[PDB]
Amino acid sequence: TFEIPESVTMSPKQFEGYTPKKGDVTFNHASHMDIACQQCHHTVPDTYTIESCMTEGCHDNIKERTEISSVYRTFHTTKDSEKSCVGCHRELKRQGPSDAPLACNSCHVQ
Amino acid sequence: TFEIPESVTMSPKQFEGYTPKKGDVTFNHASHMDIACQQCHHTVPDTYTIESCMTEGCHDNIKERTEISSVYRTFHTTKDSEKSCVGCHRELKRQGPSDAPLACNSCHVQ
Ligand code: HEM
Ligand code: HEM
Ligand code: HEM
Ligand code: HEM
Ligand code: HEM
Ligand code: HEM
Ligand code: HEM
Ligand code: HEM
């Protein structure tokens, strides 16, 4: 019965007491379909559910930036190539010509 | 919001006009958690849902046995080591000592 959402618009406006500096990000599963679900959704064994990365207790820290709980580190770190957006996209380029976006405005759009 | 069922009791009693020869099978995700979800649930790209293997149109053929749609071939074939139950369990033994069940009554229980 479980249905997967193809497109997902990730947003910083989720955090009430904060002012977003960049635009929203649209994530598409289709282009990432070859990667194991649990590779990105790495906490499935912990809760037996698939949930937002920015859930309370996970990567919901918007005030600090260097912390593992930080929204910034999590999606832009190159120290992780499995589940970090830019982290993986950068790693693909070392493996050969890749179009996986690195430019800020190629990810942050609307 | 998506919740995964740890234990799943697969049964042949689903097919009304049929008499099961073996007992039900209990599948546990915990012991299989290291395998990519889409490896077993191989039709996710097709429907963007995770559904029963024995759904109408999939592996629901109980009358024929050699067919890809056959409940028997699907779960006991050794010609596939990715998503066939005995197929993978057998392959593990070639990779080193394994306890993944091959005996009929180690899978069919209640
Ligand atoms: C594998 C085919 C796979 C599944 C299954 C899956 C599910 C899934 C769901 C159900 C959502 C919505 C979760 C919710 O209830 O909020 C969701 C969202 C995102 N996913 Fe996913 N996902 C699968 C695979 C992948 C892969 C390989 C990645 C990483 C490249 C990935 C990532 C994400 C992201 C990011 C989201 C948005 C999360 C958010 O905070 O809004 N998924 N996925
Ligand atoms: C959503 C698909 C999601 C992403 C993306 C994501 C990424 C991520 C990274 C980059 C790390 C850093 C690892 C490192 O520094 O090497 C990481 C680590 C942890 N995460 Fe995560 N994470 C996503 C989702 C979730 C969810 C829903 C939670 C909360 C249940 C969560 C938690 C954590 C924790 C804790 C860590 C560090 C310890 C660990 O278990 O690895 N993540 N995540
Ligand atoms: C992190 C949650 C994340 C986001 C966001 C993201 C976005 C993204 C975009 C915008 C594209 C372009 C196409 C599209 O919009 O669908 C794209 C493409 C690829 N990505 Fe990605 N991506 C995120 C995470 C990850 C992770 C962690 C990996 C690697 C394990 C990954 C990989 C890829 C690949 C492969 C592509 C295909 C591009 C191609 O050249 O065909 N992404 N991603
Ligand atoms: C380019 C170096 C770049 C910048 C700068 C940038 C900024 C940024 C900020 C500050 C946030 C926090 C929220 C805000 O609006 O201020 C944020 C969050 C996310 N980003 Fe980003 N981002 C840049 C580049 C990229 C690239 C190339 C991707 C996609 C691979 C990407 C993805 C994300 C995601 C996902 C988030 C979290 C959800 C959100 O707040 O939109 N960023 N980024
Ligand atoms: C990866 C962490 C993963 C997810 C996600 C997943 C989901 C899932 C669901 C939601 C069900 C119930 C489906 C329904 O609505 O009927 C389910 C059932 C089974 N799964 Fe699964 N599953 C994940 C991973 C794995 C892996 C790696 C395997 C293969 C070893 C696997 C297999 C199965 C089987 C068999 C069932 C029962 C199907 C039936 O016909 O009743 N899952 N899974
Ligand atoms: C449920 C998790 C499930 C299992 C288990 C499963 C196994 C399986 C095998 C062993 C094959 C044979 C491949 C070969 O001969 O090399 C196979 C092939 C197909 N399947 Fe399947 N399958 C499971 C689930 C599903 C579901 C829910 C459907 C129906 C949407 C489905 C369909 C098919 C089809 C069609 C094939 C052959 C062609 C192909 O796309 O690979 N399966 N499956
Ligand atoms: C096919 C849907 C399938 C079933 C059914 C199944 C059952 C099964 C059992 C009964 C065990 C024993 C433990 C338990 O009951 O949870 C077990 C263990 C392992 N399995 Fe399995 N298994 C099915 C499918 C698959 C597939 C397709 C693979 C390989 C890609 C696989 C692998 C394993 C592994 C690994 C174990 C761990 C045993 C160990 O020595 O620790 N199974 N499976
Ligand atoms: C041992 C060689 C063995 C036999 C024999 C056996 C039989 C069998 C039949 C005939 C079915 C159809 C339904 C019925 O009750 O008659 C069936 C279906 C499944 N089996 Fe099986 N099975 C044997 C062994 C194994 C092993 C080792 C596993 C687990 C790795 C296994 C799994 C399954 C699954 C799953 C099904 C489908 C769901 C069901 O009908 O119970 N079998 N098997």
From Swiss-Prot, chains A, B:
Cross-referenced CDD domains, in alphabetical order? Answer: Cytochrom_C3 (cd08168)
Coiled coil feature spans? none
InterPro entries per record: Cyt_c_III (IPR002322), Cyt_c_III_dom (IPR020942), Multihaem_cyt_sf (IPR036280)
Cofactor binding summary note: Binds 4 heme c groups covalently per monomer.
Q: Where does heme c 1 bind?
A: 29, 37, 40-41
Q: What else is known?
A: The second heme binding site has an unusual CXXXXCH motif.
Assembly and interactions? Homodimer.
UniProt-recorded name of the protein: Cytochrome c3, 26 kDa
The record lists the organism as Desulfomicrobium norvegicum (strain DSM 1741 / NCIMB 8310) (Desulfovibrio baculatus (strain Norway 4))
